[PDB]
Each structure stands twice: as structure tokens, then as C-alpha cells.
């Protein structure tokens, strides 16, 4: 007789809501076609034009929503769509405003008792730039009373501004290293300027001496974290590439203390899929950056695991109200 596995048939609908840059990227396509393998799950990718120009009432329906902010994304709308349709939300939307502010990110990490660099916030009133309390010496700064000896790190308050400066002490040749979002072959450049920036609000923080690499961590729920290291952008300024122009990736195995950081970051920020940075310095591991939704690129295993985990999260959560058989 018939061998056909009969249609469910109410599929659980997973909606993907993000800018087309992200929704159509290779890592996204790899992960979604694997999620589509789940018998009871169908993936609806929200068109960018819909997201941008249609009110939320005409956005397609879903049972589970994967949505995340990137440049130009209408987060207000994503949030009103979530309130309207009450779907199961994978990466919390309101947390994503906070993730855009480095002050908020650091406040959350502090409150969760996660090791991060010693730091101070200089808020500059754009109309009274002199008022703000900053005192600068040759090899130090004083922000809100607290003192930072060069080498120190200076970060724009907006987490979406990647113009992070690190200041060299007199004995290292002076000047600064200017980090910026990498296009081209440079990740940073030397500058002879020794005085800190004079407009804008910044976080000043202690420089964590590492071995010249950054540990990049990518979570998929609290019990899964992939890690790899990359050359610190402040080092050569040169991006290292391999055979095929792919950046070079150093091996990392997270220790127990670090697996717990990943578990806590994932939950504290309410982002199932979450990328953050670790600085392995002085026997410990400091989080310096939390970026929210992020895929690993060019890893078959990560694609398989990510899709398997997300798929299972959806099933576990929504199978019961649908009366779908699942353990
Ligand atoms: N406190 C620090 N000590 C040493 N290096 C740091 C420190 N803060 C950040 N860095 C270097 O600056 C790079 C960029 O800083 P990060 O906080 O990740 O900003 P971004 O959001 O633009 O990625 C980090 O990956 C790291 O290599
Ligand atoms: Mg970073
Ligand atoms: Mg960042």
C-alpha cells in the first residue's frame, strides 16, 4: 500500500523578520533549509518591503518569530507586531534596544556578576562640551573621578558605532589605534593623536592584555556555545586571510567558567542566538561586547547544530497547543 507520510496537517509557522541583507545571507539560507527539514515546521521569510512599508496588521502570521535589529530595521514595528500576534519569540525584541547602547549592555553584565573591564561613562552634553567632567594628562584620564592609565580603551556609547580607540602610553611610542568596521584589508590604523576625543559620549575602560586574539562566542540557547578566536583588530591593522579570502580562525575550547558566561549572557539578554566577545586576560575571561543575533559563517557543523537546536526549541514549545506528537 501507500508509503506516504500523511501531511500533519497544521504546520507550525516560523516567521523570519529582518532586513533582506540578513534574511537572504548564505548562513541564513543554510540554517533555514535545515529547519524546513522538520516535518511540522514551515518557514515564512518576511519581505523587506512588507517590513518597511506595510503596517504590522498585514505582516504574515507566525507561531514563532525570529526577528532581530540591524541598520535600518524598524524595531518599533517588530515589537508592535509581536504584541499584536503574541507569537513565541526566540530573541527578545525589547532587549534589542538595550543591545544598541554600550552603557545598557555593561549595566546588565555588571548586574549579572559577569567579569568585564573596569570602566566609566563620560556623558557629554552637546551644548556644554566643557562642563562634563574629564581631566586629561599625558598618560592618563579621569572620568567621573575614576582614573585610567594608558593603555586604555575608548568606546562610543552607541554600540553600532565601531570607532573604538585604544590609546598608547608615552613609552610605547604614543598615539592611538583607531578601530573601525572592517571593509577592505584594514581593521585599524595608527594615528599620532594622543589626546582623547572631544565631542560625543564614550565609555573609557581598562585595557585587558590578551595574547593578541579575540575569543568570539556564538550561542544557540543557553546550553550551546560555539567559540573561535581571531586576530585582535588593534594589532597589525591587517586582516589575515587564507586560501579563499576567508579570515583565519584560531581554535578555542571554552572552559567551565566560560561555558557559564555564555549560559548567563544568553539568558540575561534574552537572546537565544547571541554573539559576544571574550578577552582572555590575567587568568580570567572578560566580556567586552555583546552583539545579539549572529551566525557562525563557513561551518557545516554549526549550521547543522543551530538548525537542530532552534527546530527542537520550536517543537518543545509549540507541539502541545497544536496537539502534535513530540517527546
Ligand atoms: N578593554 C579592552 N581591552 C583590550 N582590548 C579591547 C578592550 N575592549 C575592546 N578591545 C578590542 O577592541 C575590539 C573592538 O571592541 P568591541 O567592544 O568589540 O566593539 P565592537 O562593538 O565595535 O565590536 C575588541 O574585539 C578587542 O579586540
Ligand atoms: Mg566586538
Ligand atoms: Mg559589538
Swiss-Prot record:
ATP binds at residues 102, 155, 162, 181, 205-208, 214-216, 232, 277, 289-291. The modification Phosphoserine is found at residues 6, 191. It is found in: Cytoplasm, Cytosol. It comes from Homo sapiens (Human). The C-terminal acid phosphatase-like domain binds PtdIns(3,4,5)P3 and InsP6. Despite its similarity with the phosphatase domain of histidine acid phosphatases, it has no phosphatase activity. Belongs to the histidine acid phosphatase family. VIP1 subfamily. Coiled coil: none annotated. It comes from the Eukaryota. The chain holds residues 37 to 359 of 1243 of the full protein. Substrate binds at residues 21-22, 181-182, 216, 230, 294-297. It is linked to Deafness, autosomal recessive, 100: A form of non-syndromic, sensorineural deafness characterized by prelingual hearing impairment. Sensorineural deafness results from damage to the neural receptors of the inner ear, the nerve pathways to the brain, or the area of the brain that receives sound information. Disulfide bonds: none annotated. Bifunctional inositol kinase that acts in concert with the IP6K kinases IP6K1, IP6K2 and IP6K3 to synthesize the diphosphate group-containing inositol pyrophosphates diphosphoinositol pentakisphosphate, PP-InsP5, and bis-diphosphoinositol tetrakisphosphate, (PP)2-InsP4. PP-InsP5 and (PP)2-InsP4, also respectively called InsP7 and InsP8, regulate a variety of cellular processes, including apoptosis, vesicle trafficking, cytoskeletal dynamics, exocytosis, insulin signaling and neutrophil activation. This is Inositol hexakisphosphate and diphosphoinositol-pentakisphosphate kinase 2.
